[PDB]
Design a protein around this ligand. Structure first.
Ligand SMILES: [Zn+2]
Ligand SMILES: [Zn+2]
Ligand SMILES: [Zn+2]
Ligand SMILES: [Zn+2]
Lengths: 90, 98, 93, 90
């Protein structure tokens, strides 16, 4: 009855909609292209492990986009960008 | 000058466009990149042509996670057709190197 | 916040603007789904969208929703034995 | 019945998805991975193919608009309004 929408566990659940640049629905869309909204008829909960993996993947996506902007702007700024912080183990 | 396109490291690089025998992967790397960043990489685009091992592992990890989330969605959407509630899924392992 | 000028974030027009945040999927979610661009109030980029860009986001999002409905109905056929009928395409605004 | 459009299920005006390339456009707009032999319909109608082209060109314009906005503080060149993509000729 109460499961994680993403891995179907019953353990360590909380609301997807319970309160970062991006809310968890935005993160889920960015990483999996799954649409979630309150009252969509699908499970409304996520386990801690799935929540932390969404946050980890989303920080990866943010780093990739920062790398892309700095590389593209390098011919305008002339400042070669230093290595970025990789997001570490969830 | 020779850096990871994604984290800008100089360490542990390989070509984005070569098969990497060190990482068991489940889809081609340009597709994995596109899924997360919407960046369409190609040989000769003028951008760094390399990726570090950790960025390759992260791309594979995000793809495996997406595949589990989609399996969960299919099983949940099919439940009203049979009334058999789907069991917890076997989670994808974090990808590791070699 | 020099980028926070009064244009459409997506086509740079000054005409027929409203807030991206003006009260299913909200427009920020649609933008993410179609372009992978993160928008939030105070992100330092333009906070407005023209009517035409808003309709194009809604049109592309309805296309994505139709593609997903087709996939769900196709994957149900081996369970139900009912072949799904053709879906209504969204028409360009 | 047998050959339908993967995306709208029509039997009309079909061609192969296979032979930007259309697989890339499909991933770019819907995050669906299609490949020959995936077990799913391998055809697309003209209208769905044109909708993918139109959504891909919109996404391209949004990306170009972001790059042009982000370079403005570095150069002082304010970008003028962009030519929106028109629905492509049949
Ligand atoms: Zn979970
Ligand atoms: Zn890297
Ligand atoms: Zn606009
Ligand atoms: Zn179609």
């Amino acid at each position: 009855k109460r499961v994680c929408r993403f891995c179907l566990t019953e353990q360590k659940l909380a609301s997807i909609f319970e309160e970062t640049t991006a809310n968890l629905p935005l993160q889920i869309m960015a990483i999996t292209a799954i649409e979630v909204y309150a009252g969509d008829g699908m499970p409304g909960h996520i386990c801690l492990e799935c929540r932390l993996l969404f946050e980890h993947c989303y920080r990866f996506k943010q780093m990739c986009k920062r790398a892309e902007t700095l590389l593209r702007q390098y011919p305008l700024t002339g400042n070669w960008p230093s290595p970025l912080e990789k997001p570490r183990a969830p």
